[PDB]
Design a protein around this ligand. Structure first.
Ligand SMILES: CN1CCN(S(=O)(=O)c2ccccc2-c2ccc3nc(N)nc(C(=O)N4Cc5ccccc5C4)c3c2)CC1
Length: 209
């Protein structure tokens, strides 16, 4: 049902440094997940040019940001390309490996954490604000999958037999107790305007009631 896997040692190291380093500019995680979402949105927009059948699983290309005070989650939804089980288990780790090691070196050298994006590993910035990250994803040529990790060296991958999303990805951030500021409407807006005002898809913030 659920499979557990170790992260690439370097991604594990990176994650450990994200959690155990005193860094007050935690807001960067949102620019990174939106930029990832945008990248994944570009991929499907492009694949669809060659083959328009790739939008049968959803024609709209957008990012939604959903804060939820009750569950204390900030969910970043996108209708991008989404991930295969292969991407979740093998590809993502392998493609992050070199960027992770460069980032590790940059940090020891003196580089700021905000620099993580430039090494293609901005996703793991989620762990500055999240105690657990749950990613639901669905790619046209694969089933829906739930990827979950609270760091500590491992992640789990399972078929998500919940509500089907069509195509795309939800990164569900189980925010730390001290990091609920990212659930505030005015705060999400501030970060989006300041960091990623140049994303070529509509970013809708869902107002909680
Ligand atoms: C810098 N990144 C370069 C690569 N991509 S990509 O081109 O889309 C891509 C190319 C190959 C294989 C897959 C993807 C792909 C597709 C859709 C994606 N959608 C979202 N929302 N996020 C990501 C993402 O980067 N991560 C990182 C990560 C790490 C652990 C667990 C989960 C995740 C999710 C996505 C990645 C995203 C931008």
């Amino acid at each position: 049902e659920v499979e557990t896997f170790a992260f690439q040692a370097e991604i594990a190291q990176l994650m450990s440094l994200i959690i155990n380093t005193f860094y007050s500019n935690k807001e960067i995680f949102l620019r990174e997940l939106i930029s990832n979402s945008s990248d994944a949105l570009d991929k499907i927009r492009y694949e669809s040019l060659t083959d328009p059948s790739k939008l049968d699983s959803g024609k709209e290309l957008h990012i939604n940001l959903i804060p939820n005070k009750q569950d204390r989650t900030l969910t970043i939804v996108d209708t991008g390309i989404g991930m295969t089980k292969a991407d979740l288990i093998n590809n993502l780790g392998t493609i992050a490996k070199s960027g992770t090691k460069a980032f590790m070196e940059a940090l020891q050298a003196g580089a700021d954490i905000s620099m993580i994006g430039q090494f293609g590993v901005g996703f793991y910035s989620a762990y500055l604000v999240a105690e657990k990250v749950t990613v639901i994803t669905k790619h046209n040529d694969d089933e829906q999958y739930a990827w979950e990790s609270s760091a500590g060296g491992s992640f789990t991958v399972r078929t998500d037999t919940g509500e089907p999303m069509g195509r795309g990805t939800k990164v569900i951030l189980h925010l730390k107790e001290d990091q609920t500021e990212y659930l505030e409407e005015r705060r999400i807006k501030e970060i989006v305007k300041k960091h990623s005002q140049f994303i070529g898809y509509p970013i809708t913030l869902f107002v909680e009631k």
